[PDB]
Amino acid sequence: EHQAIAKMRTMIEGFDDISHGGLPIGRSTLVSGTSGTGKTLFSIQFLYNGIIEFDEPGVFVTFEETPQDIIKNARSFGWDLAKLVDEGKLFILDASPDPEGQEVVGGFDLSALIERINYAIQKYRARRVSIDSVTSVFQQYDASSVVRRELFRLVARLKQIGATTVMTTERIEEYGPIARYGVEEFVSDNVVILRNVLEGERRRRTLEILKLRGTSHMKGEYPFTITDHGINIFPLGAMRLTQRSSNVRVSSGVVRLDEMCGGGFFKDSIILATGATGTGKTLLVSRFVENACANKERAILFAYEESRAQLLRNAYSWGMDFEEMERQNLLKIVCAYPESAGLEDHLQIIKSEINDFKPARIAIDSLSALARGVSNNAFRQFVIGVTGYAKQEEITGLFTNTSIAAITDTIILLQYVEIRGEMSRAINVFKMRGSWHDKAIREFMISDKGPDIKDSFR
Amino acid sequence: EHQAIAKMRTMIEGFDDISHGGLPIGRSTLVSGTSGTGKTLFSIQFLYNGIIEFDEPGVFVTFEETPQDIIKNARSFGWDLAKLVDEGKLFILDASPDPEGQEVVGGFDLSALIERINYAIQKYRARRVSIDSVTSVFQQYDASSVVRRELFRLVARLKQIGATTVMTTERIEEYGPIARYGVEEFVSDNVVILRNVLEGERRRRTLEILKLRGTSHMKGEYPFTITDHGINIFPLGAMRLTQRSSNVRVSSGVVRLDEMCGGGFFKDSIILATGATGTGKTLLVSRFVENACANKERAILFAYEESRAQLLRNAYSWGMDFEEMERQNLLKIVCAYPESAGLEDHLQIIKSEINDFKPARIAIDSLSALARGVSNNAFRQFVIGVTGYAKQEEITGLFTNTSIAAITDTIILLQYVEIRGEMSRAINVFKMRGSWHDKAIREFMISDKGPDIKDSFR
Amino acid sequence: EHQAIAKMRTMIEGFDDISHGGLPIGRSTLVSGTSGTGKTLFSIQFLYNGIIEFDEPGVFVTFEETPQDIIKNARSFGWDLAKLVDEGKLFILDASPDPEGQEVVGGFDLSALIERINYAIQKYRARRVSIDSVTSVFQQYDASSVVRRELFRLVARLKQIGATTVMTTERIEEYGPIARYGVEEFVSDNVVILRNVLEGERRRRTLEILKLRGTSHMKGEYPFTITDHGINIFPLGAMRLTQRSSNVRVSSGVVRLDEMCGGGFFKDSIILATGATGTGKTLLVSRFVENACANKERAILFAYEESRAQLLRNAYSWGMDFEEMERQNLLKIVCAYPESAGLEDHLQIIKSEINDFKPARIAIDSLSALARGVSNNAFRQFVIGVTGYAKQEEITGLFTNTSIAAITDTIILLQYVEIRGEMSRAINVFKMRGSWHDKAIREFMISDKGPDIKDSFR
Ligand SMILES: Nc1ncnc2c1ncn2[C@@H]1O[C@H](COP(=O)(O)OP(=O)(O)OP(=O)(O)O)[C@@H](O)[C@H]1O
Ligand SMILES: Nc1ncnc2c1ncn2[C@@H]1O[C@H](COP(=O)(O)OP(=O)(O)OP(=O)(O)O)[C@@H](O)[C@H]1O
Ligand SMILES: Nc1ncnc2c1ncn2[C@@H]1O[C@H](COP(=O)(O)OP(=O)(O)OP(=O)(O)O)[C@@H](O)[C@H]1O
Ligand SMILES: Nc1ncnc2c1ncn2[C@@H]1O[C@H](COP(=O)(O)OP(=O)(O)OP(=O)(O)O)[C@@H](O)[C@H]1O
Ligand SMILES: Nc1ncnc2c1ncn2[C@@H]1O[C@H](COP(=O)(O)OP(=O)(O)OP(=O)(O)O)[C@@H](O)[C@H]1O
Ligand SMILES: Nc1ncnc2c1ncn2[C@@H]1O[C@H](COP(=O)(O)OP(=O)(O)OP(=O)(O)O)[C@@H](O)[C@H]1O
Ligand SMILES: [Mg+2]
Ligand SMILES: [Mg+2]
Ligand SMILES: [Mg+2]
Ligand SMILES: [Mg+2]
Ligand SMILES: [Mg+2]
Ligand SMILES: [Mg+2]
């Protein structure tokens, strides 16, 4: 209702839409998670994007890893930190100890740990601080009520200096307490929790903001993925659309099908073909993709239950010759496998290939193959993400389901009808959005040229 | 995006496809698991394959087992370690204690344990170190925050020496914490966890890489099996195929069936026969196998619900004489039992027999017998593995199911039809991939010669 | 692939098929289980069968029971130990303490416990050692990391002496850790765990080998039963068969059933009669059993729902006179009750009666009565065990099920058909294996003589 707390953009893909503008300026943040969960590179990316984009130097405090290993690990993501250290922008502070030697109590914060930090801040004019593994200095005393004053004096002193801070903490369990001692969540103003939960012999990374005092955020768990470019969080939200085309109807391979359905599929719409097995869905996918090369357009076919070479053989059996249209770079075949990764990584692969090839038509074969063994919520998230990315990029998408409906625009239903001791077939344009769709039920046969929709069942 | 961390191949079957090229060079690795889980021989195999293939000497540090027992245990797998000790390649270091004597604090790392290791490394020019049961030296003090500095100084010193290291740690629970003290996962760069989980009065071994800092890997649990040659992990992934045959259609036993189905089964395809009990599925399996001897080819029949001798009796009742074609080594019968082992063991037996006999036809009788009592995910993994190995080796496979479909290529349906107070039968080629398949529904009878597909039900 | 570890046969019924030849020679073995689970008599039987069969003397170390009580407890199983002590074969060593007195630390191993053991081994030339309740000497100090070196020096010293050793350990929980302190499973080479799990107000004993270093075994839980002769484990595995009979077809009580079904039931086959209640299944069982006395053969009827006297009354109502054929010792009736014991106890009773009477025909009435309230897996094991023992002994078996099928050879289906306001019946030989089986559906009535298969339903 009035003035709010100013925030700082982290430039991590997807985090700034979750926290409503970034992290608050001048306050600490706790990033706690179990082992192997992705919390060391969060601070690395938070420093790197701040240096590169807005030209803000930052410091990095280490407790377990030497700086050379940090630079070597960050070298795999593409970005180089040794050059930025040479330029005097970034300063890796070392507080990890010697492999041999003695100790007394393990030092103290205002002894040297905050003094060297403050000297480096006033020397490099840093704006962002990333203290990593604060649990590595409190470990020497199992004194759960004594670490409160240590964390409190650290957070208060860093607030007095006036720099944005990210702290990192370890867990033991996945859905238990937020940290080890059950103290740090009641001290830090901002809490971010990372999970790596194992269910059904598969892992799944999620991110969650627990509290930001004095401002608003999004509540719940949001999935992410560590890739070659770093952490990639997936948010939600519908931007502006240009859906009002209504006259840029495109063909659907079969001209007899386009006699039905009002004159062709809309350019920005989701088409669903459904039916039992062996009924002719891959034939419709093949027609839909192979029609695109006649207008000199690009198209991608994601196959999830066929072995490419088999697709080429069946296509040449129908008279298609995907190899020729693959030579001219008008068709791409991915030929993946459903259990090779999770639905999250599959969605990332789909988005990367769509961005790489820039097509005009997308055909995902057998969504029902991606729905075997996974949970219902994850599959629903995958379907919504794929459909939203397809409709936002103005791409005609065709999906195949083996026997969602409130999301798709057109539905073609295929089936078997037993006639006189023989198994025939039938086709039916079940629904459309904004067109007349030929309410008859006609039969068809898969000949040696393709589908041939015959007269009705009267 | 840039230069990555160089890796070292362990030559374990299936591990190099999971970790994307092996283990990182010059960094430690934690292999933690419960009792009896296969973590001692992981290090033995990691040393042995490194010596044999690439000629890299290595050292083995012991804490509980005397070297003679290690050599005697490794002798059962076929490989001999005493000769390699004589050649001066491998050096079993002993740090296990005397059965009688005294102690002070149990020694220390830089006292003698790292000094003898470093002396042996500089003496034998070793490249691979396998410290086994590091928990056997930290046990004397229940000081969970004090073992952190010990493990850290060990890992850092071994990194300074610059050798690839594999450490071994014990657990108490299966799905609880990664190790005993909840510390070692936050110290070591690489974590590998082995499980031996008991569910439904059956055991199942799985392997999982939890984190590799600075590189990529596969996430989740992957099953393995300890055999006469060592650990045999089962990866995933489809290599190059030669599916584009389309012309090397083979017969299907019954020439009347080959009048249907377009002219025979394809050479590289999966055939599924389905129906209720008593409808004649083993008859089709018998015809399919006994056709192969007419062209002087090899064929295997995996029986899972019949007692060999009963198969012989029923075959002689149909006129097959399996002894004659078994005497010429053109037919092999396995005669196994479903609850005698798990699905991974069954798949390993199938693969070993296929590799041993080099056949052209595989007939697995009653997949529905293997699916009783097991979980759904394990059965799906078994089906995909068997089908992938069959289609990779260019082998015609016939599977029997008693009343999957998206993986098979042809489907034959059998059923009962009650006509005029009598129970008849019928046949129906339900689907095919890349052929015309005679959409009629005809009856057949199991006479004293075999099946006789009669006219239609009009 | 090469030379393996030599093993020693324990001669316990069923254990030598699980561990592939017995226990390894010269190494310890941990037998841990909760209270009342059957681990004291395991060592007693391991010593006794070694003395009796292979003429190997042994020693028995006691910690809580005086030797006189051990002899008195072993006297109930039939075997006598006092005679073997007199002959100088068995030596029951005593280490249990005095009911009154003092102590210092509770002694020590190399003080007297291993020295008296070694003296007895060198005196009696013993080969087998059975130390019982090793937890009774480490109990005085709750020092879970200090018992490790004690167990280690005990196992190493016993290996140096060179005798096969069986140790016994206690638990508190059923599916928790293997022992009390979570140490002994990481020390001993061989681990055997006994369970006595309570589920559904019933107990069930199982056995499991967890690890044998350097050799192979069976993985999972295997049920056993303590009887008058000792522990009796139930393994799996199909030996040689003589199923190729095909010409010894026996009659089926009703001759009108025998012009159907090809000429009679096969002599070594499993017959299943199924249908609703009140349909006439016990009549078929009665005919099947009472046919056997006409050829002067033996037959057993296991009744599980009816009540002896009632069977006699209904048989005399049908004209059977079971008392006369019982007087000549050609018929035996068991007259048990389903909830009187567990499925393993029922299977053991069935096997004992079959071995005792040496019959030619078994009729188990109402398998569906044994399947009420039990789990699915245990019932499946019961069915497979009964069928395998019946087919291995060359015994014709008839089973009754009230409305499996992939294991039985013939199926007779019985039902109700409502005709014109009256409830009739029908019969149908649903399936056979290796014979022609009269595919019609005929009716029958239960008259005052027996069944009368009438004409068909056309
Ligand atoms: N280039 C990469 N591509 C894919 N995944 C990567 C890549 N680099 C690292 N990873 C993954 O990211 C994770 C590494 O996380 P990071 O080391 O930054 O923190 P952390 O392991 O959670 O920290 P800590 O070890 O202190 O608990 C691992 O799961 C690793 O497999
Ligand atoms: N040359 C051909 N002549 C006749 N029919 C053919 C030919 N090639 C393929 N078919 C037909 O292809 C059908 C197999 O199904 P199809 O490959 O069209 O996939 P789908 O049922 O749409 O879906 P899915 O790929 O998920 O099984 C069979 O019914 C078969 O008749
Ligand atoms: N030749 C073999 N064939 C099959 N299984 C074997 C063979 N040799 C050993 N095994 C099995 O491998 C396992 C032995 O594992 P290994 O001795 O390498 O380590 P571990 O038992 O996990 O170690 P620790 O005892 O320290 O916990 C056991 O399950 C054993 O039954
Ligand atoms: N000599 C024979 N004459 C007539 N019918 C026979 C003969 N031998 C076997 N049969 C037939 O065999 C059938 C038994 O089924 P079959 O052994 O063919 O297996 P299936 O139904 O394909 O599957 P399953 O392996 O589950 O039994 C019976 O219906 C019976 O009619
Ligand atoms: N003759 C017998 N018939 C049937 N069951 C018997 C017979 N004798 C003993 N049992 C049963 O066997 C078990 C006795 O086991 P045993 O005394 O050998 O060891 P344990 O009870 O497991 O040992 P501990 O008391 O040290 O825990 C009891 O369940 C007892 O009821
Ligand atoms: N003397 C009789 N006259 C006519 N019918 C009789 C006579 N005795 C018995 N029955 C018949 O016995 C039937 C009862 O079923 P029956 O005792 O044959 O067992 P079942 O249905 O095969 O199985 P279960 O004994 O397991 O319930 C009744 O339908 C009844 O008609
Ligand atoms: Mg880290
Ligand atoms: Mg398809
Ligand atoms: Mg070990
Ligand atoms: Mg069969
Ligand atoms: Mg006892
Ligand atoms: Mg009855």
What would the DSSP string read from start to end of A377-434?
Answer: HHHHHHHHHHHHHHHHTT-EEEEEEE--TTT-SEEEEEEEEEETTEEEEEEEEEE-SS
Residues B383/B322, Cβ–Cβ less than 8 Å: no
Contacts of B19 in chain A (CB under 8 A): none
The first and second tokens of residue A233, run together, are 């969080």
Phi, psi of B239 (to 5 degrees): -85, -165
Task: Determine the distance in angstroms separating the CA of B304 from the nearest CA of chain A, rounded to an integer.
Answer: 26
Taking the CA atoms of A316, A321, A326 and A330 in sequence, report the sign of the dihedral they define. negative
Angle, CA of C143, C147 and C149, to the nearest 5° = 130
- Cα(C281)–Cα(C283) distance, rounded to whole angstroms? 5
The dihedral built from the CA positions of residue C132, C136, C141 and C144, taken in this order, carries a sign that is positive
Strands B164-170 and B128-131: parallel
Q: Which amino acid is at C174?
A: E
Find the radius of gyration of the CA atoms of chain B: 28
**Beta-sheet pairing, A451-456 with A442-446:** antiparallel
Judgement on whether residues A270 and A134 belong to the same structural domain of the protein: no
* Residue of A36, A277, A317 lying closest to B211 (CB–CB): A36
Q: Are A29 and A23 in contact (CB under 8 A)?
A: yes
In the numeric block, which tokens belong to residue B169?
């740690």
- How far is it, in rounded angstroms, from Cα C292 to Cα C308? 19
CB A412 within 8 A of CB A396: no
Q: Nearest 5°: phi and psi at A300?
A: -120, 140
- Cα separation, A59 vs B48, whole angstroms: 45
CA angle B237/B240/B243 to nearest 5° reads 115
CA distances for A287 relative to A361, A398, A414, B265, angstroms: 12, 11, 16, 26
C-alpha–C-alpha distance, residues B107 and B150, integer Å? 12
Experimental technique, in short, is: cryo-EM
Structure tokens belonging to residue B456: 């239609």
B224 and B286, same structural domain? no
Look at C2 and B73 and tell me if their CB atoms are within 8 Å. Answer: no
One domain, residues A170 and A278: no
Question: Which of A317, A373, A422 is facing B380, going by the closest CB pair?
Answer: A373
Name all chains with 3 or more CB-CB pairs below 8 Å to chain B: A, C
Would residue B239 count as lying in a domain?
no
Three-state DSSP class for A252? coil
Phi, then psi, of A455 in degrees rounded to 5: -80, 180
* Cα atoms in the 13 Å half-sphere on the side-chain side of A268: 14
Residue B355 and residue B332: Cα distance in Å, rounded? 13
Atom from ligand 6 closest to the CA of residue C400: 26
Q: Are residues C310 and C217 part of one domain?
A: no
* Total domains in the fold of chain A: 2
* Residues B267 and B250: beta-carbon distance below 8 Å: yes
Residues C229 and C260 in one domain: no
Residue B112 DSSP label: I
- For C18, half-sphere exposure in the C-beta direction (CA atoms, 13 angstrom radius) is 24
Resolution, given in Å to one decimal, reads 3.3
Alpha carbon distance C284, C253 (integer Å): 8
In our burial notation (b when 16+ CB lie closer than 10 A, e otherwise), range A393-430 reads bebbbbbbbbebeeebbbbbbbebeeeebebbbbbbbe
Question: Is residue B325 situated within a structural domain?
Answer: yes
Radius of gyration of chain C (CA): 28
Cα separation, B236 vs C352, whole angstroms: 50
The pair of three-digit structure tokens given for residue B163, joined into one six-digit string? 């050798």
Residues C108, C27 contacting (CB under 8 angstroms): no
For residues A187 and A265, state if they share a domain.
no
Q: What sign does the CA torsion over B238, B239, B244, B249 have?
A: negative
Q: Considering every ligand atom shown, identify the ligand nearest to the alpha carbon of residue A275 and give its number.
A: 2
In this structure, the answer to whether residues C196 and C280 fall within a common structural domain is no
Return d(Cα B355, Cα C368) in angstroms, integer: 44
B376 lines ligand 3 (CB under 6 A): no
Domain CATH number, residue A53: 3.40.50.300
Q: Are residues C220 and C282 in the same domain?
A: no
d(CA B149, nearest CA chain A) in Å: 8
- Residue pair A194/A207 in contact (Cβ under 8 Å)? The answer is yes
The closest CB to that of B277, out of C221, C406, C434, belongs to: C406
Helix then strand then coil, in percent of chain C rounded to 5, is 30, 25, 45
Count other C-beta atoms under 10 Å from residue A36's C-beta. 21
Mark whether A195 and A71 lie in a shared domain. yes
C7: CB partners within 8 A, 6+ apart:
C19, C20, C21, C22, C23, C24, C25, C215
Integer Cα distance of B442 and B455 in angstroms? 5
Q: CA dist A72 to A80, B128, B213, Å?
A: 9, 22, 10
For chain B, the first-to-last Cα distance in angstroms comes to: 66
Say if residues C232 and C207 touch (Cβ distance below 8 Å). Answer: no
- Which domain-ending residue is among C183, C202, C233? C233
Contact between residue B159 and residue B26 where contact means Cβ atoms under 8 Å apart: yes
| Distance of alpha carbon B22 from alpha carbon B8, whole angstroms | 5
Domain shared by B79 and B187, yes or no: yes
Longest CA–CA separation in chain B, Å: 94
- Residue A111 is given by DSSP the state I
Q: Which residues have a Cβ under 8 Å from the Cβ of B213 and sit 6 or more positions away? A: A73, B189, B190
Task: Identify the CA nearest to C289 among candidates C261, C307, C274, C311.
Answer: C311
Helical packing angle, C343-357 and C376-392, nearest 10°: 10
Conformation bin of residue B329: beta by default, left when phi > 0, alpha when psi is -120 to 50? left
After which residue numbers is chain A interrupted with C–N beyond 2.5 angstroms?
Answer: 403
Q: Binding site: which residues of A? A: 36-41, 76, 211-213, 215, 217, 227-228, 277-283, 305, 318, 425, 431-433, 435, 437, 439
Asked if B336 contacts B352 with a C-beta cutoff of 8 angstroms, the reply is no
- For B110, the token pair is 């830089």
A409 Cβ neighbours under 8 A, 6+ residues apart? A266, A269, A270, A271, A432, A433
| B101 part of a folded domain | yes
* Residue C238 belongs to some domain of the structure: no
Show residues of chain B in contact with A337, CB under 8 Å: 236-238
CB environment B60-94: b (16+ within 10 A), e (fewer): bbbbbbebebbebbbbbbebebeebeeeebbbbbe
A366 lines ligand 2 (CB under 6 A): yes
Using CA atoms, how far residue A56 sits from A14, A43, A59, in Å, is 21, 14, 10
DSSP state of C358: -
d(CA B184, CA B188): 6
Give the mutation candidate from C216, C429, C439 for the B interface (greatest B CB count, under 10 A).
C439
Whether A446 maps to a domain, the answer reads yes
Q: CA dist A213 to A5, A16, A221, A432, C223, Å?
A: 10, 17, 19, 48, 60
> Which residue of B314, B337, B422 to mutate against C (max C Cβ within 10 Å)?
B422
Give the residue among C395, C272, C258, C240 at the shortest CA–CA distance from B310. Answer: C240
Provide the domain limits for residue B436.
255-456
User: Phi and psi dihedrals of C155, rounded to 5?
Assistant: -65, -40
Q: Are residues B52 and B137 in the same domain?
A: yes
- Catalytic residue, from B53, B64, B87, B174: name it: B64
**Strands C331-333 and C361-364: what pairing?**
unpaired
- Most A CBs within 10 Å, among B210, B261, B408, to test the A interface: B210
Q: Does residue A236 sit in helix, strand or coil?
A: coil
Of A233, A267, A283, the residue that ends a domain is: A233
Per-residue tokens: B364: 């697995």
**Residue C125: how many other CB atoms lie within 10 Å:** 9
Of C409, C262, C437, C260, the C-alpha closest to B310 is C409
Q: How far apart are the first and last CA of chain A?
A: 67
Contact: chain A with chain C (3+ CB pairs below 8 Å): no
Which chains sit next to A, with 3 or more Cβ pairs under 8 A?
B
Among the residues of C87-145, which ranges form H helices?
A: 114-124
C353 plus C415 within the same structural domain: yes
Q: Any idea what the Cα angle at residue C276 is, between residues C272 and C279, rounded to 5°?
A: 85
Joined together, the tokens standing for residue C421 give 């306001």
- Token duo for residue C341: 């014991």
SS3 B206: strand
**Set B56, B65, B170, B305: catalytic member:** B305
CB B381 within 8 A of CB B343: yes
Asked if C316 contacts C310 with a C-beta cutoff of 8 angstroms, the reply is no
Contact A7, A25 (CB under 8 A): yes
The whole-angstrom separation of Cα A104 and Cα A401 is: 67
CA–CA separation, C353 vs A365, rounded Å? 61
How far apart (Å, rounded) are the C-alpha atoms in residues C51 and A121?
82
Cα C194 to Cα B300: distance, rounded to the nearest angstrom: 40
Residue entry with tokens 């030596």: C91
* Residue B250 domain flag: no
Neighbours of B114 (CB within 10 A): 18
- What separation, in Å, do the N-terminal and C-terminal C-alpha atoms of chain C show? 66
Do residues B285 and B300 lie in contact, with contact meaning Cβ atoms separated by under 8 Å?
no
Check pocket membership of C213 for ligand 3, CB cut-off 6 A: yes
Instruction: Say how far apart CA A64 and CA A132 lie, in whole Å.
Output: 9
Of B181, B202, B233, the domain-final residue: B233
For residue C144, the tally of other CB atoms under 10 A from its CB is: 14
How is residue C96 written in tokens?
């249990």
Q: For chain B, give the number of residues.
A: 458
Burial class (CB within 10 angstroms; exposed 0-12, middle 13-18, buried 19+) of A340: middle
The DSSP code sequence of B290-304 is HHGGGGT--EEEE-S
C428 phi and psi angles, rounded to 5 deg: -160, 115
Residue C3 CB contacts under 8 Å (≥ 6 apart), including other chains: B75, B76
Neighbouring-strand partners of residue A7: A24
Residue tagged active-site, from C56, C65, C305, C443: C305
Beta-sheet strands, E only, within B43-181: 58-62, 90-94, 128-131, 164-170
Asked if C434 and B307 touch (Cβ cutoff 8 Å), the reply is: no
Q: Is B278 annotated as a binding residue?
A: yes
Report the distance separating Cα B127 and Cα B59, nearest Å: 8
- Look at residue A243 and tell me if it is in a domain: no
Q: Which helix or strand (DSSP H or E) is residue A32 part of?
A: strand A30-33
How is residue C441 written in tokens? 């559906």
Residue C10: C-alpha distances to residues A391, C159, C219, C234 (Å): 72, 19, 19, 15
Neighbours of C386 (CB within 10 A): 25
CB neighbours of residue B310 within 10 Å: 23
Q: Which residue has the tokens 């006439």?
A: C280
Return the residues preceding each gap in chain B, C–N over 2.5 A, or none.
403
Residue C29 region, left (φ>0) first, then alpha (ψ -120 to 50), else beta? beta
C218: left (phi over 0), alpha (psi -120 to 50) or beta: beta
CB contact at 8 A, B435 and B261: yes
Active site annotation includes C64:
yes
Q: Compute the distance between CA of residue B156 and CA of residue B187 in angstroms, rounded to an integer.
A: 10
- At A308, list the tokens: 């490419």
Give CA–CA dist C159/B413, Å, rounded: 63
Look at residue C242 and tell me if it is in a domain. no
**What gap in Å lies between CA A211 and CA A191, rounded to an integer?**
6
